[PDB]
Structure formats: structure tokens, C-alpha cells
From a paper:
We report here for the first time, the structure of VVTK, one of the smallest type 2 TKs known, in complex with [name] at 3.1 Å resolution. The four VVTK subunits within the tetramer are identical apart from a flexible loop (residues 40 to 60) situated on the surface. As found in other type 2 TKs, VVTK has a central α/β domain structure consisting of six parallel β-strands surrounded by helices. Above the α/β domain, a zinc-binding domain is present, the latter belongs to the structural zinc-binding class. Although no zinc was added during purification or crystallization, the metal is present in the structure and coordinated to four cysteines. The phosphates of [name] bind to the α/β domain, whereas the thymine base and the deoxyribose bind between the lasso domain and the α/β domain. The thymine moiety is bound to the backbone of the protein via residues Phe-113, Ile-157 and 159. In the VVTK active site Ser-148 replaces the equivalent residue in hTK, Thr-163, a serine being also present in UuTK. Asp-43 and Arg-45 are only observed in the VVTK subunit D, they are disordered in the other three subunits, indicating the flexible nature of this loop. The Ser18Thr mutant shows a greater enhancement of enzyme activity (~3.8-fold) than does Thr19Ser and indeed in our structure, Ser-18 forms hydrogen bonds via its main-chain nitrogen to a γ-phosphate oxygen and via its side-chain oxygen to the magnesium and a γ-phosphate oxygen.
Author numbering:
A (entry chain C): 4 to 43, 54 to 176
B (entry chain A): 4 to 44, 60 to 176
C (entry chain B): 4 to 44, 53 to 176
D (entry chain D): 4 to 48, 51 to 176
The structure:
């Protein structure tokens, strides 16, 4: 078995790498699947959809490779990935390290300690136009988990993050 | 200006990175374009030198399968010198592991350069070379997995 | 300011990269320094390296250095906020540390550091058993207490299949 | 067998990575060696020997072949300087040997170094490092000679060359 990991802010190109990393295995004729967070499992166009990796476990039971965009949203992430890898399965996880508060996401960091490879990607800064490595919420909100595109958040460099 | 470069065999996930690298700039509200090679098996050309005129207003340019452009080097180059980000995806070597058409020359005037790995279609380990299945010759001949294989070293040898 | 980070097990080549990453800036005529924990068994050229147990002490003298290196960052409890604060003062902090222990448990409050870090990478060792990409550290002795220093005579860089005793 | 490759300008931190990459194997109890180029060589402030730690010295990889005949891993700072580079690395890898090569892609003229590029086509991994620019202090990716010289191969440290970004190179 084996575990990969990708992180960085948003607009990093995260989800995109993940898929690139998966196709690799699929195009070598591999049993590949993709879980992602829904916010209510449910198929799509290949790949599944859940809120807790622990449900799907049963069906993904025959796939060698598993991808997961937005891993942090699964509370049962860590032990899932882990256990799965221990069963000879390649788990490629894409997720955000930190929140709009630059605080570690839901029990996600813990994942990077039992991970064979880990990398952190860089976005371009939407302010000063240099290597963005952090995500910033535009609205004056609170509650950790709230989904959006660039109409809601910004990939910023350090100097830009500060208000 | 500035130049990026991505290489490796086929099935490396090359074209896919390229786009990922582009969207990054586009999703920061940039003038992005993509050239790619035509009459095979975003714009479309056979010589970067034609298109020059229209891409004249784009800050970022992508090019899957760069090697196919003879006028590659000096195009990318010149463009970068005009403040344009040129992200190129191409193959370093042929099915003969020989350098592609004047492509290597590009990697000397390139700010960043990386080589990707495929999975081997034989022993299922890190494939880093491309191999033609048919008993053919002529360098340039387009195909998918029905024609080529991403193989490790031990596998490449006939 | 700006923060780099390097992790992975032991024999990864961690400390070694760190230095490489530093010289880069130094050889561009930069104010460079290296903090490290009371430990090991480093090179040559110019203004370089201190020694502490708490980054918070040294703060005063490194006060004039643009770049700071730290092999074995996890050993500093006051790591996070130090690196952080420093970076906020326009200083480049390149940290080398271990993500996980011999129990593959996150090291002392270290992970927290990787959330306020511009670049983060994890290196691979070679496995001392099956001779493939080792990504985890394993203690040879039948010990416990998290922090206990050693070289290959104590630990091993192992792949997954090998980690399971 | 297997072949690694590192490039970029000077002050990139090339030679240093190479070693880091080697120790990895050595500290896993591997037969490791280091060739390097010699005839004008000092910097500053054939036959086996320590430092670089079990490392040799040559001008043509083809000589040493005989003794390195028993080493699984081989390192080579400044590969470009060996004309017989390509085929050496290559052949060696074909014999189950890990060849980690460090070299410069381009000259002070940003022209490909002596038959070096050819090497990167038969290479499992290849990466290009970045220096800091000695002028504008940003990612230097090219090497520039300070003197008003010509002849491709002429050895030196920062007292001779500079790691520069693009805008700075146009001297
Ligand atoms: C920062 C932040 C994001 N989110 C949400 C918004 C997004 O839907 C998601 C993060 O998006 P990503 O995982 O970055 O989306 P992506 O796959 O497009 O990757 P990238 O943009 O780098 O290429 O999490 C929160 O719910 N809370 C937060 O604090
Ligand atoms: C190997 C080889 C390929 N070709 C052709 C076949 C391909 O259609 C084309 C290059 O295709 P690719 O560049 O491999 O297309 P891709 O970017 O999707 O690859 P990847 O999956 O790694 O991302 O060149 C030759 O003409 N001669 C050759 O020797
Ligand atoms: C795994 C583990 C190691 N250690 C100790 C043993 C070592 O002295 C130290 C590890 O630091 P190292 O990674 O060995 O620092 P380094 O300079 O050797 O960098 P590298 O080898 O990657 O090139 O921490 C613990 O105290 N507890 C643990 O659980
Ligand atoms: C650019 C250039 C270098 N040289 C020489 C000078 C140098 O001593 C040698 C290459 O320098 P480097 O290989 O860069 O020396 P290094 O590996 O220790 O530096 P670093 O690792 O930090 O990148 O080649 C030429 O003869 N002609 C040239 O055009
Ligand atoms: Mg996103
Ligand atoms: Mg392809
Ligand atoms: Mg160590
Ligand atoms: Mg040098
Ligand atoms: Zn910015
Ligand atoms: Zn193979
Ligand atoms: Zn092993
Ligand atoms: Zn510059």
C-alpha cells in the first residue's frame, strides 16, 4: 500500500493535480475511484460522492487507487486513508492544510504523518500577483466550513493576507 | 517575462499539468491562450510563428506537444522576453529515446524545468520512457495507448 | 517575510537540504544564521550558526539576520510562533524537522507550523530493509519516551511494509 | 539500474544536492562513489580516497570504469565536463547501477553544455534548481560570466560568475 498528499491554499491547482496523479494509474489499467465532499453516497461520471469515507468503504472495496478532493471535510479521513493503504491501496489525497484563519483544517494535519509523500502547492496572489500560499475569505464571516469559488475567497501572498 | 517547462514520456500526465499550471494564472484574471499541434491522428497551429500576431495580447501561453514546433525555442524565448509567461509541455525523447526535434535546446533558456513519471505498462513501476508497439520508423507519428507504452528501463529493452 | 519547510523521516537528507537552501541566500550576500538543538555529531564560510533549546532566547541576537535555518525544529516547543513572528518581520525562516515520531505520531506541536508556511516538502529516504523509498522512521530498541537522539545505530528508514514490527 | 539528473546555473546548490542524494544510499549501506573533474581545480574559503567520502577523480569517465566496477551508486558533480558522459551513465545504469549526475545545462552564453542535454533523454528523473539572483535578488536561473572572456570551459567561483534572473542576464 501507499499514501500521497497534496496541499496548499485554494486556486493552487489542487484538485487538478489529484486527477492527473490518478489517471496515471488508471491509464495503466488500474482500479481507480474518486471520493469527494457533497454536503447533503452518489455516483457521477465514474467517481463517487460522500460525506463520510466510512460509508463508501464497502464498494470502493475493490479499487486499488482512491482519490479524494477536499479531504479535510471528511472527519474520518486519517484512519480511512491509513487503514486503506494498509490493505495495499494507493490513496491520493488533495486537501487544504489551513483555513481562512490559517488554522489547521479539521484533523487533517494528522494525516501528513502517516503519508509517504506530501507536497504543498502555490497559487498566484490575486493582489500583488506573486506566489500565493494562503487562502483568504472576502466576506466578514466566521463558521469554518463554507464552500465557494473566487467570488468568495482569494489566493494571497503573506503581505496581502494581513487585512 | 518567464518560461516554464514540463517533460517526460507519454501518459506522464503532461498535457494535464500544463493546463493546471495555466488555470492558475487565468483564475487570477490573466490573458491566457493555448497553442497545440494540428493535422494529427485556445488556438491551433503547426508553426508558432503564424499565430504570433493574435496571441500578441496574451500574458500567458500554453503549448502541449511543443516538440512538434520547429520554431519552438526562439518563439518561447522571444515571447518571454516580451514579458510573457510561456508554459511548455513536450516530450524530451522519441520512441528511440533520442532527443525530439530541437527541443532540448529550449531547456537551457528556461526558468523552471521538470520531468514527470508515468506508471510502467509492463512491470507497473515508475515509467520514464516511451516505447512504440508497432514495427515502425518515421519519428513523428501520433497515437494513444493503442500505439505506445510508458515503460521502465528494464522494460524498454525490446 | 517568508517561511520554507522540509520534513520526512531520518536519513531523508533533511539537515543537508536545509543548508543547501541557506547557502543559496548567503552566497547572494545575505545575513544568514543557523539555530540547532543541543544534540548531534556544520560546514564552512562566514557568519553562520548558534545553538539553543528555546528559539525565544536567541531572538535578541539573530535580531539582525534576514535568513534563519533550524535543523530538528520539532525539538523547539516555541517553534511555531517563533518562525511565524520572525517571518512577519521580513525574515526568511527555513525549517528542517520531522513530521512524525517512531510511533508515526506528529512531533511536538510541529504540524501546526505547516499551515502558516509558504512552501512545504517531504523528502524520502531509502528503506534499510527492502531498499525502496523509505518514508518513515523506526526505532530499533524496545524504548518509549518520545525524544531520544541517535544515528543509524538506533533508528531505521523504512518503507510501509517494513514499518510493521 | 537507474539514472538521476540535477541542473540549473551556478550557486543553484547543485553539487550539494548531489551529495545529499548519495548519502541517502550510502547510509543504507550501499557501494557509493563520486567522480569529479580535475585540471584547474580549486575553489575556496584514477585512485580512491576519502572526503566526498570514497570519491575518485578523472577527466574521462571511461578510465575509472574498471574500479568503480563494484559500486552500485555513482555521483558526478560537473558532468558536462566529461565528453564520454552520456554513454557512460547510460551503460552503467544498464548494469543495475544508480547514476546521480549533477551538471550545468547551459553555458555563460546560455548554450547547451558539451553533449550534456543528450543525457536527459535517457534519464529517469531530471530536475532544474534555482539560485538567487546576485543583481535583483530574485530566482536566478542562469549563469553569467563577469569577465569579457570567450572559451567555453573556464572554472570559477562567485569571483568570476553570477547567478542572475532573466532581466539581469541581458548584460
Ligand atoms: C478556506 C476555506 C475553504 N472552504 C471551501 C471552499 C472550497 O469549496 C474548498 C477549497 O477548495 P479547493 O480544494 O482548493 O478546490 P480545488 O479542487 O479547486 O483546488 P484548487 O482551487 O487549489 O485548484 O473548501 C471552506 O469551506 N472553508 C474555508 O475556510
Ligand atoms: C513517443 C512518441 C509520440 N509521438 C506522438 C504520439 C502522441 O500523440 C504525441 C505526444 O502525446 P503526449 O504529449 O504524450 O500527449 P499527453 O500530453 O496527453 O501525454 P500525457 O498523457 O503524458 O500528458 O506525440 C510521436 O510522434 N513519436 C514518438 O516517438
Ligand atoms: C523518530 C525519532 C527520532 N528522534 C531523534 C533521533 C535523531 O537524533 C533526531 C532526528 O534528526 P535527523 O533527521 O536525523 O536530523 P539530520 O541532520 O540527520 O537530517 P537528515 O538525517 O534527514 O539528513 O531525532 C527522536 O528523538 N524521537 C523519535 O521518535
Ligand atoms: C557557466 C560556466 C561554468 N563553467 C565552470 C565554472 C564552475 O567552476 C563550474 C560549474 O559550477 P557549479 O557546478 O555550479 O559548481 P557547484 O556545483 O559547486 O555550484 P552549485 O552546486 O552551487 O550550483 O563550471 C565554465 O567553465 N563555463 C561556463 O560557461
Ligand atoms: Mg479550490
Ligand atoms: Mg500522452
Ligand atoms: Mg537523520
Ligand atoms: Mg558552483
Ligand atoms: Zn500578494
Ligand atoms: Zn517496467
Ligand atoms: Zn522497506
Ligand atoms: Zn535579477
Amino acid at each position: 500500500g501507499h499514501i500521497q498528499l497534496i496541499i496548499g491554499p485554494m486556486f493552487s491547482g489542487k484538485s487538478t493535480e489529484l486527477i492527473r496523479r490518478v489517471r496515471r494509474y488508471q491509464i495503466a489499467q488500474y482500479k481507480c475511484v474518486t471520493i469527494k465532499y457533497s454536503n447533503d453516497d452518489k455516483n457521477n461520471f465514474e467517481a463517487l460522492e460522500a460525506t463520510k469515507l466510512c460509508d463508501v468503504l464497502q464498494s470502493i472495496t475493490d479499487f486499488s487507487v482512491i482519490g479524494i478532493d477536499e479531504g479535510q471535510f471528511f472527519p474520518d479521513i486519517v484512519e480511512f486513508c491509513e487503514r486503506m493503504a494498509n490493505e495495499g491501496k494507493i490513496v491520493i489525497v488533495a486537501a487544504l492544510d489551513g483555513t481562512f484563519q490559517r488554522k489547521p483544517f479539521n484533523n487533517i494535519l494528522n494525516l501528513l504523518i502517516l503519508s509517504e509523500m506530501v507536497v504543498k502547492l502555490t497559487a498566484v496572489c490575486m493582489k500583488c500577483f506573486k506566489e500565493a500560499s494562503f487562502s483568504k475569505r472576502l466576506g466578514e464571516e466566521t463558521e469554518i466550513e463554507i464552500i465557494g469559488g473566487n467570488d468568495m475567497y482569494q489566493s494571497v501572498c503573506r503581505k496581502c493576507y494581513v487585512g
